[PDB]
Scaffold this motif. Structure first.
Motif, mmCIF file in Angstrom:
data_model
loop_
_atom_site.group_PDB
_atom_site.id
_atom_site.type_symbol
_atom_site.label_atom_id
_atom_site.label_comp_id
_atom_site.label_asym_id
_atom_site.label_seq_id
_atom_site.Cartn_x
_atom_site.Cartn_y
_atom_site.Cartn_z
ATOM 1 N N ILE C 57 0.832 -1.199 0.000
ATOM 2 C CA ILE C 57 0.000 0.000 0.000
ATOM 3 C C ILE C 57 0.869 1.252 0.000
ATOM 4 O O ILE C 57 0.555 2.242 -0.673
ATOM 5 N N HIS C 61 0.790 4.119 -2.767
ATOM 6 C CA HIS C 61 0.577 5.524 -2.445
ATOM 7 C C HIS C 61 1.774 6.388 -2.812
ATOM 8 O O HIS C 61 1.618 7.602 -2.989
ATOM 9 N N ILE D 14 -5.618 -2.408 -4.399
ATOM 10 C CA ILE D 14 -5.547 -2.530 -2.948
ATOM 11 C C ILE D 14 -4.988 -3.907 -2.617
ATOM 12 O O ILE D 14 -5.463 -4.920 -3.144
ATOM 13 N N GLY D 15 -3.967 -3.941 -1.763
ATOM 14 C CA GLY D 15 -3.270 -5.167 -1.449
ATOM 15 C C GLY D 15 -3.655 -5.754 -0.104
ATOM 16 O O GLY D 15 -4.196 -5.072 0.766
ATOM 17 N N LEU D 17 -5.921 -8.039 0.516
ATOM 18 C CA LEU D 17 -7.309 -8.468 0.619
ATOM 19 C C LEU D 17 -7.702 -9.381 -0.537
ATOM 20 O O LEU D 17 -8.856 -9.382 -0.969
ATOM 21 N N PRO D 55 -12.222 0.922 11.429
ATOM 22 C CA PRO D 55 -12.827 1.868 10.479
ATOM 23 C C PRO D 55 -11.997 2.090 9.231
ATOM 24 O O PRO D 55 -12.546 2.527 8.214
ATOM 25 N N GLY D 56 -10.691 1.835 9.279
ATOM 26 C CA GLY D 56 -9.882 1.900 8.080
ATOM 27 C C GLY D 56 -9.443 0.540 7.578
ATOM 28 O O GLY D 56 -8.485 -0.040 8.094
ATOM 29 N N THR D 57 -10.135 0.024 6.575
ATOM 30 C CA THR D 57 -9.778 -1.253 5.966
ATOM 31 C C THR D 57 -9.697 -1.193 4.449
ATOM 32 O O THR D 57 -8.827 -1.841 3.860
ATOM 33 N N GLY D 58 -10.576 -0.432 3.805
ATOM 34 C CA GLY D 58 -10.700 -0.475 2.362
ATOM 35 C C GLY D 58 -12.096 -0.882 1.935
ATOM 36 O O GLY D 58 -12.326 -1.223 0.771
ATOM 37 N N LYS D 59 -13.036 -0.857 2.885
ATOM 38 C CA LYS D 59 -14.415 -1.224 2.580
ATOM 39 C C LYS D 59 -15.033 -0.263 1.572
ATOM 40 O O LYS D 59 -15.727 -0.689 0.641
ATOM 41 N N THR D 60 -14.800 1.040 1.747
ATOM 42 C CA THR D 60 -15.306 2.019 0.789
ATOM 43 C C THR D 60 -14.643 1.848 -0.572
ATOM 44 O O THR D 60 -15.305 1.967 -1.609
ATOM 45 N N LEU D 61 -13.336 1.572 -0.589
ATOM 46 C CA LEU D 61 -12.648 1.324 -1.852
ATOM 47 C C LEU D 61 -13.204 0.088 -2.547
ATOM 48 O O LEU D 61 -13.441 0.104 -3.761
HETATM 49 N N1 LIG Z 1 -5.854 -1.699 1.962
HETATM 50 C C1 LIG Z 1 -5.712 -0.459 1.453
HETATM 51 N N2 LIG Z 1 -5.034 -0.263 0.297
HETATM 52 C C2 LIG Z 1 -4.881 0.959 -0.228
HETATM 53 N N3 LIG Z 1 -5.368 2.086 0.325
HETATM 54 C C3 LIG Z 1 -6.071 2.043 1.494
HETATM 55 C C4 LIG Z 1 -6.279 0.741 2.117
HETATM 56 N N4 LIG Z 1 -6.995 0.951 3.241
HETATM 57 C C5 LIG Z 1 -7.224 2.278 3.322
HETATM 58 N N5 LIG Z 1 -6.685 2.959 2.277
HETATM 59 C C6 LIG Z 1 -6.771 4.418 2.106
HETATM 60 O O1 LIG Z 1 -7.901 4.907 2.844
HETATM 61 C C7 LIG Z 1 -8.798 5.657 2.017
HETATM 62 C C8 LIG Z 1 -10.108 4.898 1.843
HETATM 63 O O2 LIG Z 1 -10.812 4.774 3.074
HETATM 64 P P1 LIG Z 1 -11.317 3.317 3.549
HETATM 65 O O3 LIG Z 1 -10.316 2.772 4.540
HETATM 66 O O4 LIG Z 1 -11.687 2.514 2.322
HETATM 67 O O5 LIG Z 1 -12.670 3.612 4.368
HETATM 68 P P2 LIG Z 1 -13.494 2.398 5.038
HETATM 69 O O6 LIG Z 1 -12.458 1.531 5.711
HETATM 70 O O7 LIG Z 1 -14.448 3.079 5.989
HETATM 71 O O8 LIG Z 1 -14.143 1.729 3.855
HETATM 72 C C9 LIG Z 1 -8.125 5.832 0.670
HETATM 73 O O9 LIG Z 1 -7.533 7.133 0.578
HETATM 74 C C10 LIG Z 1 -7.035 4.787 0.649
HETATM 75 O O10 LIG Z 1 -5.864 5.332 0.045
#
Ligand SMILES: Nc1ncnc2c1ncn2[C@@H]1O[C@H](COP(=O)(O)OP(=O)(O)O)[C@@H](O)[C@H]1O
Lengths: 68, 444, 67, 67, 159
Positions: C57, C61, D14-15, D17, D55-61
């Protein structure tokens, strides 16, 4: 038995284990479990076919040993 | 998978080639054991590249010293010790795959099955499955085509085909197992595998000899029992391939086969759509099958097959290429079966066309038209009606038939009233036409 | 509203070829009636990113970075 | 608001997962691409999957990528 | 076994009778031989009554069926293959070859007679569509029977 022996179920599936539970599992869940014991990537209903839906829905509320 | 703890790259570099020299002919097993201890140390240290190199060296030592039996239990011990590293064992199988294919030998079949047993413990889709596919294909070539290995390659393909396939390698593997399945002459399983793979199309737009090979192996499977409509559908599906690769002999013989098959198929609305679509082809005119199709498709002609065997039967003896015709009708056993399949096919066709033309036809004439006797004609007539194809009622004592449904007096007077209203409309149109033409004709 | 949602997604008439993907932050406070098997067939926890996953990641980034 | 998905990057960006990625494939793509296999199985495909964690995993992505 | 017996006599559905008969035979697994024989006989009788003799071969090839194999079991298999051939004569031949083995009035003779009537009706109806008026001795020739029995069956259907 409605779905005739669970649509030709195997012998080694008996309900002795998944029913002596004390975990509610209302008749609606019983019918759903009967209709969800249906993973059949082969000919007939078997034990390995069950264990996917047989280990799924495991029985949380427990601990009757203190009372007995 | 797991983080490396203690690397031994220096140790293996300084010792492994020396160990190879110390056991150039492999007479020493203490050398094998001490590298097993060394790779165990790196395995407990969670190092993958060192273990993989040790395994590759171990099998390479067995290759050069040609101990076939000791290789068998050595690779068995290596693959069963604790399962080691999945990367290392997947590697070791790969060089084993590269080595078993160069030495013919007698017991390589034992080498092939040994590695198959080592990889069949699981971990197929994960950590290399193409090796197992190649070994099974290698076994096919070693046994030169039989039923046991054809069944083995039948029961292997499904996992890797669903998991990780190749647009060329995997489909060729499927093509190379169905031909063996057809060689075994199993029909139910060969049909099942063919219908579960043919769902994967839209690659045939760039086929060289793949779609045609698939089809030419499933021609025999379908036509063996009863198929005659699917036969014409994929014979025209091999007819459109010479459209982009114009070679005359295969193209023309494909035209001869599809035209004969599409007519030979049992009557149905879909078959009528195909014969009408096939007819009118600009490139189809230069063959005698054009005259055959034009005669035998429409206008309800009397298809007396006794006359047709000489009027349009020349494809049996000599035509332009007569290679599909000899395959269909020139054969002895299956050819005479298809001859009988032409014999009846024109009988239902003659019955069907007679249905829309003649209401009541005497039994002698119908039997003569069907080129059979009274009992045979009535037997086929019973065969049509049980299929609901025709609305026929026969008086067997009198030997007379009828094809018109008894008109209920309700709708009988309705069509009479509709006939009346059609006449009434014609009076209105004629009156307006004549009176106005009267007006033009007396402008003088 | 929750009861209407439950009886329109599972209820008496089920959906066909329709899949629901949902996420949250507090799994314990969820109503046990919804999370029973039949309505939620699979439960997946997205854990902490791995050290090599964090490395990937970070490289992603730091792709368009002058370094 | 369901037809205004912004231009995202591929789900391969995204790596860590990949297990979650294949979980999404065998819950969405597999039931519709190959119903014949499940017909031989004779079962209904699963309905839904749950994601939960920090709360930060990549679920929104992941949700935006599949959208 | 009794529940399957009642459901078999009800005749609304026979598949549930198959389930009850198999459960009874499963309870009679090498425990009570005469009751096991009756349960499997009733199980196979309703299976062929389902007009699906294809699963009969698998059912009789089962381990328990071979364990409890007998002359009556073989007779039922011949009855099943008669249903396969759709030959009412073959069913009648099988009944005569093993008569005392299948002469039981309770849900044995009654169902075999009912099935025999079904094949008679199906054979007559299958061969009757073409004919607006057919001589009945020709119909007997196609069905491979005598004249009185064919006339009696064709009457009882049409009354
Ligand atoms: N596994 C991941 N790989 C790449 N970017 C990530 C990852 N997790 C979080 N991010 C970063 O966090 C932001 C997206 O928020 P996210 O963590 O998806 O929200 P949530 O976890 O509530 O779905 C993006 O700017 C992204 O760059």
């Amino acid at each position: 038995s409605k779905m005739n022996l669970s649509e030709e179920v195997d012998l080694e599936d008996y309900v002795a284990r998944p029913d002596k539970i004390s975990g509610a599992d209302i008749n609606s869940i019983c019918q759903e479990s009967g209709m969800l014991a249906v993973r059949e990537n082969r000919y007939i209903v078997l034990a390995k076919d069950f264990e996917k839906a047989y280990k799924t829905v495991i029985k949380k509320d427990e601990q009757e040993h203190e009372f007995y | 998978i797991v983080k490396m703890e203690v690397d031994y790259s220096a140790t293996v570099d300084q010792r492994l080639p020396e160990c190879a020299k110390l056991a150039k002919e492999g007479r020493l097993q203490e050398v094998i054991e001490t590298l097993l201890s060394l790779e165990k140390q790196t395995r407990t240290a969670s190092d993958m590249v060192s273990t993989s190199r040790i395994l590759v060296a171990v099998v390479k030592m067995c290759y050069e010293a040609k101990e076939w039996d000791l290789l068998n239990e050595n690779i068995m011990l290596l693959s069963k010790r604790r399962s080691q590293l999945k990367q290392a064992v997947a590697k070791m199988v790969q060089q084993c795959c590269t080595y078993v294919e160069e030495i013919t030998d007698l017991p390589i079949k034992l080498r092939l099955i040994d590695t198959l047993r080592m990889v069949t413990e699981g971990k197929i889709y994960v950590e290399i499955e193409r090796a197992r596919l190649t070994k099974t294909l290698a076994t096919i070539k070693e046994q030169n085509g039989d039923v046991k290995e054809a069944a083995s390659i039948l029961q292997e393909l499904q996992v890797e085909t669903y998991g990780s396939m190749e647009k060329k390698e995997r489909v060729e593997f499927i093509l190379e197992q169905m031909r063996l399945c057809l060689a075994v002459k199993d029909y139910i399983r060969t049909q099942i595998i063919s219908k579960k793979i043919n769902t994967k199309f839209f690659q045939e737009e760039n086929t060289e000899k793949l779609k045609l090979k698939y089809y030419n192996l499933m021609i025999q499977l379908d036509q063996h029992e009863g198929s005659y409509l699917s036969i014409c559908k994929h014979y025209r599906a091999i007819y459109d391939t010479p459209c982009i690769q114009a070679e005359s002999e295969k193209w023309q013989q494909a035209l001869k086969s599809v035209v004969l098959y599409v007519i030979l198929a049992p009557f149905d609305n879909e078959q009528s759509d195909l014969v009408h679509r096939i007819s009118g082809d600009k490139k189809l005119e230069e063959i005698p099958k054009y005259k055959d199709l034009l005669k035998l498709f429409t206008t309800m002609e009397l298809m007396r097959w006794s006359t047709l065997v000489e009027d349009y039967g020349m494809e049996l003896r000599k035509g332009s290429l007569e290679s599909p015709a000899t395959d269909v009708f020139g054969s002895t056993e299956e050819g005479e079966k298809r001859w009988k399949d032409l014999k009846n096919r024109v009988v239902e066709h003659n019955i069907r066309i007679m249905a829309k033309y003649y209401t009541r036809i005497t039994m002698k004439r119908m039997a003569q038209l069907l080129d059979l006797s009274v009992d045979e004609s009535e037997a086929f007539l019973s065969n049509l009606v049980v299929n609901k194809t025709i609305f026929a009622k026969v008086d067997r004592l009198a030997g007379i038939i009828n094809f018109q449904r008894p008109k209920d007096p309700n709708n009988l007077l309705n069509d009479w009233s509709q006939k009346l209203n059609s006449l009434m409309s014609l009076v209105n149109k004629t009156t307006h036409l004549i009176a106005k033409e009267e007006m033009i004709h007396n402008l003088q | 509203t929750l009861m209407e949602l439950l009886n329109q997604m599972d209820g008496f008439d089920t959906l066909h070829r329709v899949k629901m993907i949902m996420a949250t932050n507090r799994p314990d406070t969820l109503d046990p009636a919804l999370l029973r098997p039949g309505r939620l067939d699979r439960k997946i926890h997205i854990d902490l990113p791995n050290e090599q996953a964090r490395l990937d990641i970070l490289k992603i980034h730091a792709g368009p970075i002058t370094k | 608001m369901s037809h205004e998905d912004p231009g995202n990057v591929s789900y391969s960006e995204i790596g860590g997962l990949s297990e979650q990625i294949r979980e999404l494939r065998e819950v969405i793509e597999l039931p519709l691409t190959n119903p014949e296999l499940f017909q031989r199985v004779g079962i209904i495909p699963p309905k839904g999957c749950l994601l939960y964690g920090p709360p930060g995993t990549g679920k929104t992505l992941l949700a935006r990528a599949v959208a | 076994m009794q529940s399957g017996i009642i459901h078999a006599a009800e005749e609304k559905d026979w598949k549930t009778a198959y389930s009850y008969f198999y459960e009874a035979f499963e309870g009679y697994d090498s425990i009570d031989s005469p009751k096991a024989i009756t349960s499997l006989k009733y199980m196979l009788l309703c299976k062929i009554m389902l007009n699906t003799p294809e699963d009969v071969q698998a059912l009789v090839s089962g381990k328990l069926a071979l364990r409890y194999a007998g002359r009556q079991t073989e007779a039922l298999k011949c009855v099943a293959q008669a249903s396969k051939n759709r030959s009412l004569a073959d069913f009648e031949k099988a009944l005569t070859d093993y008569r005392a083995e299948l002469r039981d009035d309770p849900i044995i003779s009654t169902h075999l007679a009912k099935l025999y009537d079904n094949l008679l009706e199906q054979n007559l109806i299958r061969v009757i569509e073409p004919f607006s008026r057919v001589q009945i001795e020709h119909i007997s020739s196609l069905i491979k029977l005598s004249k009185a029995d064919v006339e009696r069956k064709l009457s009882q259907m049409i009354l």
